[PDB]
């Protein structure tokens, strides 16, 4: 299946040119840019592995694109995303996050149904790949 976390995951995987434009948008929003990745796309996994430190006063999209590819090279079969962080008083949070790399094939998720009181069920979602050690996923 196709993981749809990310702002544009319902559109075809972005091209470095399209990504380049998004970085422009981020630069205009005076955002801080971060690159993160993981091979455990559980939707509740809020902390993906961080790729270096976030880039702050960015002026050249190529610089950011450089790392995106640097990471792609080091994490071929991991999900990779670009995040834009705002520090405006009312926001102080991520205001954009899109996928920039996916493994060649995504098996999807397993759904456990643990029967509780009466008809209630305690659910558990877990990626089939997460049932394997990190160095063997995808």
């Amino acid at each position: 299946m196709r993981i749809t976390q990310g702002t544009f995951s319902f559109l075809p995987d972005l091209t470095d040119e399209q990504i380049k434009k998004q970085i422009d948008y981020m630069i205009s929003k005076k955002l801080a840019i971060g690159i993160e990745y993981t091979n455990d796309i559980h939707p509740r996994n809020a902390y993906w592995e961080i790729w270096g430190l976030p880039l702050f006063d960015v002026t050249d999209p190529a610089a950011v694109l450089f790392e995106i590819n640097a990471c792609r090279k080091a994490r071929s079969n991991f999900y990779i995303k670009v995040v834009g962080f705002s520090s405006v008083r009312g926001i102080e949070s991520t205001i954009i996050s899109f996928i920039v790399n996916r493994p060649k094939h995504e098996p999807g998720f397993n759904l456990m149904r643990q029967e509780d009181k009466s008809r209630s069920i305690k659910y558990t979602i877990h990626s089939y790949e997460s049932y394997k050690p990190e160095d063997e996923r995808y």
């Binding site: 749809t4 948008y25 939707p43 759904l111 659910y123």
Partner: protein, 473 residues
């Protein structure tokens, strides 16, 4: 022998003479300010009318009472300090009134409203009255909770940023059974919607009691999450006759894992505030459907303007609220609507006569309410929707999803793709308003679901004359 002889000697005197009219009053940063649209009966001096509204909504009565002397009357009395003629209307005036902070009970919308809109709307001497805007003071705003979750925390819990959210009210409104209800929920969520929702009138009825809907719906929500890798949600409506019953439904929603629940404005302010606290206490997203609002907000001559409700509800602590669409089936002037969105999202408000915001207003850091646009909209209007409504909003397509000829999943995908294409274009700094139709057209080339949607409701429009319109345009 003890009878009085002065300002407080028995007898009736005009309100403007009782201390309720003071054009020299200097507004205090702690005052609660209100702006009314007054329409006095013919023969009645507007200043005396404003003063009557100021008097009757604070500490006065139709006749002089000596008991005033036992209080700090000069301080407690509200003051009408400004009266302007409404731009192009010889029968209306805008009356500014200041209320001392000590008059209100901390954190109570009910008390706030009891004074402001208690009796003044039924005064014979005033042919028509409308509350247009309010200036809630920093010190007073701090006694309120504000949004339980708030737009920022909400997006973090959902792991969704930089784009509107998509939802869908299940159709038909009423009549569907639990099992089937969940069917709809699964299909729409898996298809691409972020949320699906109970209709405001879906509570617990002979055709479907609430517990089944909750069970089945949660199964649907979890399957969808597992089928997409997204945090999904369905607005479980806990609206009920009593607080005990509402707590029963909200708590069950909490037990089953729901990320969000909903309530109708028709339950009332106190029940709402009670639920707002419950949500903050239970890490739940609280969606508020403005049921009944247009009952007093539609007309320009009488009632209350929805932006005031937006302030009160953001104070109460509600997380979502239908603030209107601009191209949908319901009433909604574009500029006035911008007013509603700013009131719910901005950390500070600026006076704007066009938008109807008569006061500059700090929001004391209270969290942001997520605006919802619902009713009559469909993919294809996406460029207008983004242009008018913006990024922070929940785009709700009811029939705009289920109506699709190829199934619910298809209807949903169409909207999700339409939405993403449009903002990917916005980010690319394109004149998407203008290039809109083409952007959707260019995206639909890769998704049959969208193509179809675009053809079905191609010329569907809702062009009518607005009722709630600006005075400075």
């Amino acid at each position: 022998t003890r009878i009085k002889n002065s300002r407080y000697e028995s007898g009736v005197i005009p309100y403007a003479k009782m201390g309720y009219w003071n054009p020299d009053y200097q507004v205090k940063d702690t005052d609660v300010l209100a702006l009314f649209r007054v329409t006095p009966q013919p023969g009645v001096d507007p200043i005396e009318a404003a003063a009557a509204v100021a008097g009757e909504s604070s500490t006065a009565t139709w006749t002089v009472v000596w008991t005033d002397l036992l209080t700090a009357a000069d301080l407690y009395r509200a003051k009408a300090y400004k009266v302007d003629q409404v731009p192009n209307n010889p029968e209306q005036y805008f009356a500014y009134i200041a209320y001392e902070l000590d008059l209100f009970e901390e954190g109570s919308i009910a008390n706030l409203t009891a004074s402001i809109i208690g009796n003044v709307f039924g005064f014979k001497a005033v042919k028509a009255l409308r509350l247009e805007d309010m200036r809630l003071p920093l010190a007073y705003l701090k006694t309120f909770q504000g949004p339980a979750t708030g737009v920022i925390l909400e997006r973090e819990r959902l792991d969704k940023f930089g784009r509107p959210l998509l939802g869908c009210t299940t159709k038909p409104k009423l009549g569907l059974s639990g099992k089937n209800y969940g069917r709809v929920v699964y299909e729409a969520l898996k298809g691409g919607l972020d949320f699906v929702k109970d209709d405001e009138n879906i509570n617990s009825q002979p055709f479907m009691r609430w517990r089944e809907r909750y069970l089945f719906t949660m199964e649907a929500v979890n399957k969808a999450s597992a089928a997409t890798g997204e945090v999904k949600g369905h607005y479980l409506n806990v609206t009920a006759a009593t607080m005990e019953e509402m707590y029963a439904r909200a708590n069950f929603a909490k037990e089953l894992g729901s990320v969000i629940i909903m309530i109708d404005l028709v339950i009332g302010y106190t029940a709402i505030q009670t639920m707002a606290k419950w949500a903050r206490d239970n890490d739940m997203i609280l969606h508020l459907h403005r049921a009944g609002n247009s009952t007093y907000s539609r007309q320009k001559n009488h009632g209350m303007n929805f932006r005031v409700i937006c302030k009160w509800m953001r104070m109460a602590g509600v997380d979502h609220i239908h603030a209107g669409t601009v191209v949908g089936k319901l009433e909604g002037d574009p500029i006035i609507t911008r007013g509603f969105y700013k009131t719910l999202l901005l950390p500070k408000l600026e006076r704007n006569l066009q938008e109807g915001l008569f006061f500059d207003m700090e929001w004391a850091s209270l969290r942001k309410v997520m605006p919802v646009a619902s009713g009559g909209i469909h993919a294809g209007q996406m460029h207008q929707l983004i242009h008018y409504l913006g990024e922070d909003v929940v785009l709700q397509f009811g029939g705009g999803t289920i109506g699709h000829p190829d199934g619910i999943q298809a209807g949903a995908t169409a909207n999700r793709v339409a939405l993403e294409a449009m903002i990917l274009a916005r980010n690319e700094n394109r004149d998407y308003l203008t290039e809109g139709p083409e952007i959707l057209r260019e995206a639909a080339k890769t998704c049959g679901a969208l193509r179809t949607a675009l053809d079905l409701w191609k010329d569907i429009t809702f062009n009518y004359t607005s009722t709630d319109t600006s005075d400075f345009v």
